[PDB]
Amino acid sequence: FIQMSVQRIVEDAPPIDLQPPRYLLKFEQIYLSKPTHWERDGAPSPMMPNEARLRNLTYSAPLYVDITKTVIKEGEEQLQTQHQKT
Amino acid sequence: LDLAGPLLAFLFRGMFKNLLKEVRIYAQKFIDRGKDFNLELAIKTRIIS
C-alpha cells in the first residue's frame, strides 16, 4: 500500500481545473520519511515506538507531494511554479 | 480478503478527494477576486491526518 497504492491514488486523481485567467494543479510524486516528532518548539526528533506508547503519541510519518501549479494569463506564457515537499 | 493495504487505500481515496474538494472550494472563493493564489494555506493537513 505505502509503496504502490498511495502513488497510484495521488496520480490517478483528476487534475484540478479552476478560473479571466485559468489555473491548473497537478501532483507529481509523493515522498515519505521515517517517523518523526513535531515537538512543541518545532524541533525534529526520531520517535521510538516505546516513547509513542509511553507519551500517548501517534506513530506516524509526514507525507510530502510535489505540486506543479500552472497559471494561464492569456498572454501565451503559462507560468508553472513547482513546489517541493508539500 | 481485504488486508491493511486495500483497507487503507479505500480509506485514503475518499480523504484525498475531500482534500482536493476543499482546495477547490477555498481556491475558487479566494480567486473570485482574481488577485493571486497560494497553496500552503489552501491545504488542510488535518483532513487526512
Curated annotation (Swiss-Prot), chain B:
It is found in: Nucleus. DNA promoter binds at K17. It comes from the Eukaryota. Catalytic core component of RNA polymerase II (Pol II), a DNA-dependent RNA polymerase which synthesizes mRNA precursors and many functional non-coding RNAs using the four ribonucleoside triphosphates as substrates. Pol II-mediated transcription cycle proceeds through transcription initiation, transcription elongation and transcription termination stages. RNA-dependent RNA polymerase that catalyzes the extension of a non-coding RNA (ncRNA) at the 3'-end using the four ribonucleoside triphosphates as substrates. An internal ncRNA sequence near the 3'-end serves as a template in a single-round Pol II-mediated RNA polymerization reaction. May decrease the stability of ncRNAs that repress Pol II-mediated gene transcription. Belongs to the RNA polymerase beta chain family. Component of the RNA polymerase II (Pol II) core complex consisting of 12 subunits: a ten-subunit catalytic core composed of POLR2A/RPB1, POLR2B/RPB2, POLR2C/RPB3, POLR2I/RPB9, POLR2J/RPB11, POLR2E/RPABC1, POLR2F/RPABC2, POLR2H/RPABC3, POLR2K/RPABC4 and POLR2L/RPABC5 and a mobile stalk composed of two subunits POLR2D/RPB4 and POLR2G/RPB7, protruding from the core and functioning primarily in transcription initiation. Part of Pol II(G) complex, in which Pol II core associates with an additional subunit POLR2M; unlike conventional Pol II, Pol II(G) functions as a transcriptional repressor. This is DNA-directed RNA polymerase II subunit RPB2. It comes from Homo sapiens. The gene is POLR2B.
